[PDB]
């Protein structure tokens, strides 16, 4: 809606009740700069080289989480406890680079239309769950105030390997699995 | 039965820092009810939920919030974004394969500005070319796939032409049967 | 070099 050369998302805070689920992130031009690990009280830059140059004290993340704790209570009471409606996420599996057998690659599961930001994104290798080699981004904000999350599986392409990205969300009657094969 | 509150601070930059727009959003369950807009200059209720708070924010936080255009948006851009995000340059990797349709895979580049063209025996092809939307990998790299529908013949040469700000000269990759 | 958060202001409740 607002046209500009560059857009920076600073102070982005999400809080949920019940359960004390919170998130704090920064973005530039649609890419996550960093998130603040609320449990460890540490800033975690998506590109560590950026954090070697730029300081963000994690206090800013904690403060905005705490203030959003207060704000959620005010708005929940004012809205007569109108609950959030669980949307159905959509998923897409694609490789980071063209797939060559034997050369390491990364499977990217792009899941959009996530609300509320609670999701289980898991990978299946030969229909069995894969634990190691998995990384996912923070909940990234959308203009319609839903979220999107990306999960990465680092793998070695092989003849006898088929992969599935399984998504579990409250707004899905059954878990959705998106298949990918070489 | 879950309830969500969101805070969104947004800085919009055009022509360096010559034009800065600061937007602050208060959202309850995907409903933005209160917003500060530096173009408007004051807090405004967006929906029903924010009428009880719009005047309070203007009576308590307006002057401080307006200063955040310089204090936060200008500071963050000039001091932190120019040496890290606005200086990032990732060279694209180009590869061709046949699906018939030739798929030119341009991957792992940053920033988004890219030009990819298809050439057959030295002449640019446009009629049969179809490109995917720019794909954001989420790791500060982009990728895009450019397709050319063709019929492979013995001596034809197909070339994928890619231009990017991270390239002094364009990348060329040829494909033959 | 330090990036600054945009700060949440409390709702009057």
């Amino acid at each position, epitope marked *: 809606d607002i046209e500009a050369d560059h857009v920076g998302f600073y102070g982005t805070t999400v809080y949920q009740s019940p359960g004390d689920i919170g998130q704090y992130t920064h973005e530039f031009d649609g890419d996550e700069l960093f998130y603040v690990d609320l449990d460890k009280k540490k800033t975690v830059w998506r590109l560590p080289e950026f954090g070697q140059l730029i300081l963000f*004290e994690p*206090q800013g993340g*904690l*403060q905005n989480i*705490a*203030a959003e704790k207060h704000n959620l209570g005010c708005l929940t009471k004012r809205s007569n406890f109108t609950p959030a409606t669980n949307e159905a996420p959509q998923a897409t599996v694609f490789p980071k680079s063209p797939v060559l057998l034997g050369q390491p690659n990364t499977l990217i599961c792009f899941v959009d239309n996530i609300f509320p930001p609670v999701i289980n994104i898991t990978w299946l290798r030969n229909s069995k769950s894969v634990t190691d080699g998995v990384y996912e981004t923070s909940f990234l904000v959308n203009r319609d105030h839903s979220f999107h999350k990306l999960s990465y599986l680092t793998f070695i392409p092989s003849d006898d390997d088929i992969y599935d990205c399984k998504v579990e969300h409250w707004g899905l009657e059954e878990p959705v699995l998106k298949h990918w094969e070489p | 039965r879950h309830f969500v509150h969101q805070f969104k601070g947004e800085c919009y930059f055009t022509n360096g820092t010559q034009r800065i727009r600061l937007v602050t959003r208060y959202i309850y369950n995907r409903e933005e009810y209160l917003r500060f807009d530096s173009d408007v200059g004051e807090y405004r209720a967006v929906t029903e939920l924010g009428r009880h708070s719009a005047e309070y924010y203007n009576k308590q*936080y307006l002057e401080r919030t307006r200063a955040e255009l310089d204090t936060a948006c200008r500071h963050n851009y000039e*001091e932190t974004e120019v040496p890290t995000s606005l200086r990032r340059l990732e060279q694209p990797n180009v590869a061709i394969s046949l699906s018939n349709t030739l798929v030119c895979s341009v991957t792992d580049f940053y920033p988004a500005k890219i030009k990819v063209r298809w050439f057959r025996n030295g002449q640019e092809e446009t009629v049969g070319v179809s490109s995917t939307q720019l794909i954001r990998n989420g790791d500060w790299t982009f990728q895009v796939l450019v397709m050319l529908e063709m019929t492979p013949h013995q001596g034809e040469v197909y070339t994928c032409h890619v231009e990017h700000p991270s390239l002094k000269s364009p990348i060329t990759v040829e494909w033959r049967a | 070099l330090q990036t*600054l958060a945009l*700060e949440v202001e409390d709702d009057p409740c």
Partner: T-cell receptor
Amino acid sequence: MGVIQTPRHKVTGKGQEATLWCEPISGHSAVFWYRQTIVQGLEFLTYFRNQAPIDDSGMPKERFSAQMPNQSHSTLKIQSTQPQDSAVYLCASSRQGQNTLYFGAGTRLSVLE
Amino acid sequence: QVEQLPSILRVQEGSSASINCSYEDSASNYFPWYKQEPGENPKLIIDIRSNMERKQTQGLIVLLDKKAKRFSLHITDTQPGDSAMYFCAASVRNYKYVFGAGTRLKVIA
């Protein structure tokens, strides 16, 4: 209104445990603790917002702690009181980002040998 | 770190007083001033933000030099009621204020 700190004065001996109480102004989510001495003036100790500890960079690394059990009272606890702990401990509350801090009258603590 | 000078300021009635503070953190953007009468609590009297350079409000003047990293308070036409302890502060964000050592301003009758 006004921030209420209790006790106004505290005289204790070495090795005792002293706890300092601060009542912020009703509606103020931000709570500050400061040490006041004649030489160094005001020194930041800790900061709270909505009962959550956010910044304790000015706290001594031993014997000192701060808590907010409810939303209306904050405690500053010193364990095994020592003479160098003697200072005026001010508490401040605020309701706006980077704006007026409302200070209490402070607790004058003296630890004698 | 915020260095506040002078520690003691003796000035005669009607004359002007000047307190100068400097700060190390170039990210500092909020500069309040606090007045404390003896036994009482510090009270904000005037402040300034990084986007501004000068502010006059009823015989109180604050200057800010972002480049030099210095800010000053100036009490024109000092009165005996102004005799108090003055503290200057520099804030990068809301979660920490860095105060100076203070200035004991004595306005002599």
